[PDB]
């Protein structure tokens, strides 16, 4: 019975990719309508330490209980699993915020990664919030992205391993069957593909009724996505799910939100989207 949101906020490092309006957008996102009146919010690609700190404190009031950013540090977590390392260029970009008390937070970094994700601390963020005396479990993640310069179909095989680490993590956790375990973020798997079928079984997850927009990364309507690759071919990559072997919500749906801000400026060039990805809402109906 949660109202979630998962946005890939597209906060690339302002040191290595200085001109994407990370700080501006952190404000836009904070002043937006979709981040508001939810229970839990999962951010993705909040890599830049500065802008992500602003994003988090723009949200601090409505969602007081927050975790660090996955991969960032080893301090501030109840537990740190996986292949964490302090010799890597970037973190994992994943952070979870909440209206309700967080009574546990583990971070887990994936063993496998190729291309740019190889020099990151990408993995998932387990969370155990407590709403109204009841325990709810929320996992935010962000798997291997399509890297044109790494292996052949290795990105696909790596995602398989990663999603496997998540499902293995949940079974080893002995979480009561009467408690729901959400699993969201940018899974980098286009909806309704042979790989999408594999993803459901690897994540140990049921499918969801979809609402709104049938695209998550859409170069036809997104100013930033249009800029990146105007060539097109919209994809659907953001999901929130629930473990099939745990307490299942009535009618869980992912809704793709297309809300936009007043056009902003980045060195003369104008755009109007909180990120190159659209946020997704989740709720039972």
């Amino acid at each position: 019975d949660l109202k979630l949101v998962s946005h890939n906020v597209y906060m690339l490092s302002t040191v290595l990719y200085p001109n994407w309006g990370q700080y501006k957008r952190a404000d836009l996102i904070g002043q937006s309508s979709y981040i508001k009146n939810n229970d839990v919010v999962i951010f993705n690609e909040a890599f830049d330490n500065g802008a992500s700190d602003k994003l988090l404190s723009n949200v601090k009031k409505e969602y007081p209980y927050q975790t660090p950013v996955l991969g960032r540090s080893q301090s501030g977590w109840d537990k740190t699993e996986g292949s964490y390392s302090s010799t890597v260029a970037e973190d994992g970009g994943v952070a979870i915020v909440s209206k309700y008390p967080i009574k546990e937070k583990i971070q887990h970094v994936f063993k496998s990664g190729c291309g740019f994700d190889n020099d990151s601390n990408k993995g998932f963020v387990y969370t155990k919030i407590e709403k109204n005396g009841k325990n709810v479990h929320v996992i935010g993640t962000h798997t291997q992205s399509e890297d044109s310069r790494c292996g052949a179909g290795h990105d696909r095989k790596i995602r398989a391993e990663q999603m496997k680490e998540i499902s293995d993590f949940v079974k080893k956790k002995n979480i009561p069957k009467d408690e729901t375990v959400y699993i969201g973020g940018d899974l980098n798997v286009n909806k309704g593909t042979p790989e999408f079928k594999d993803m459901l079984k690897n994540l140990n997850v049921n499918d969801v009724l979809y609402a709104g927009h049938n695209s998550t990364w859409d170069p036809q309507s997104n100013s930033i996505a249009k800029y990146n690759y105007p060539n097109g071919k919209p994809e659907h990559l953001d999901y929130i799910f629930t473990d099939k072997d745990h307490k299942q919500p009535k009618q869980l749906v992912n809704e793709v939100v297309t809300e936009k801000p007043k056009p902003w400026d980045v060195d003369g060039y104008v755009y109007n989207d909180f990120s190159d990805h659209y946020p997704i809402k989740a709720y039972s109906k």
Side-chain angles (χ1 to χ4, degrees):
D1 315 330
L2 272 178
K3 305 177 81 290
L4 311 209
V5 167
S6 169
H7 202 162
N8 186 313
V9 293
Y10 195 55
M11 255 72 159
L12 302 180
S13 177
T14 48
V15 177
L16 294 73
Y17 324 81
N19 299 140
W20 271 127
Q22 289 91 131
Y23 285 88
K24 197 83 158 62
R25 284 187 283 108
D27 287 336
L28 277 325
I29 292 177
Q31 264 66 40
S32 77
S33 298
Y34 72 93
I35 37 69
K36 69 170 75 289
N37 203 358
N38 301 108
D39 293 342
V40 174
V41 175
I42 312 170
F43 296 115
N44 276 326
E45 291 199 20
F47 298 112
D48 180 54
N49 304 354
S52 69
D53 275 0
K54 314 315 174 70
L55 174 58
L56 285 166
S57 57
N58 269 66
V59 172
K60 192 85 171 193
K61 175 201 170 297
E62 187 157 44
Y63 305 85
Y65 313 85
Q66 309 180 351
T67 73
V69 176
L70 180 255
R72 185 79 60 84
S73 63
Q74 214 154 28
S75 312
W77 301 95
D78 299 43
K79 211 274 184 305
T80 295
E81 304 187 13
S83 291
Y84 183 98
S85 55
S86 309
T87 65
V88 75
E90 191 71 61
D91 52 39
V94 191
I96 302 187
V97 307
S98 177
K99 270 211 217 299
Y100 305 83
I102 299 179
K103 312 216 68 180
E104 183 170 15
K105 42 198 154 207
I106 295 83
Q107 67 179 338
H108 180 104
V109 172
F110 299 126
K111 263 61 70 174
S112 43
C114 80
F116 282 85
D117 287 12
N118 207 341
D119 203 15
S120 294
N121 261 143
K122 304 189 61 171
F124 60 92
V125 176
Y126 168 83
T127 223
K128 199 271 282 298
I129 109 164
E130 169 174 326
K131 173 152 155 278
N132 306 162
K134 309 174 183 181
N135 277 6
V136 191
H137 312 254
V138 175
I139 295 193
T141 195
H142 184 205
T143 53
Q144 182 72 38
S145 45
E146 315 164 20
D147 197 318
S148 302
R149 289 202 169 111
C150 93
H154 279 75
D155 62 332
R156 172 168 177 173
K157 284 172 283 187
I158 291 166
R159 277 192 291 266
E161 184 179 355
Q162 292 175 342
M163 283 159 190
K164 213 82 270 282
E165 292 178 37
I166 295 176
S167 53
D168 290 335
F169 168 84
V170 182
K171 53 83 177 167
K172 84 166 189 62
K173 206 64 175 47
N174 289 343
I175 306 176
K177 262 59 179 174
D178 49 305
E179 292 165 355
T180 312
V181 187
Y182 296 85
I183 301 175
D186 186 0
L187 314 190
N188 286 310
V189 174
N190 202 349
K191 192 210 299 171
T193 65
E195 172 170 26
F196 176 90
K197 263 64 80 61
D198 297 352
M199 178 201 65
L200 294 182
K201 280 62 211 70
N202 291 165
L203 272 186
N204 198 243
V205 141
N206 284 305
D207 194 28
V208 170
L209 300 188
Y210 302 94
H213 203 251
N214 65 168
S215 194
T216 255
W217 178 81
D218 185 3
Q220 293 181 340
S221 50
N222 197 100
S223 318
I224 308 167
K226 174 183 270 282
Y227 185 99
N228 293 335
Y229 297 89
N231 322 307
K233 202 278 191 57
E235 305 190 35
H236 192 109
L237 313 168
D238 284 40
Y239 308 86
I240 106 144
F241 291 123
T242 59
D243 193 80
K244 62 160 83 286
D245 283 310
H246 282 82
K247 205 274 200 55
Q248 211 83 178
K250 297 190 306 171
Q251 202 80 106
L252 191 63
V253 343
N254 293 15
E255 174 180 351
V256 181
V257 173
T258 64
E259 183 194 336
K260 304 190 174 185
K262 286 182 170 183
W264 83 78
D265 184 27
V266 49
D267 300 325
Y269 294 77
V270 181
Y271 308 92
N272 56 296
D273 283 290
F274 303 96
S275 170
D276 74 338
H277 277 234
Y278 291 119
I280 85 180
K281 292 184 175 303
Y283 47 89
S284 285
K285 304 202 67 175

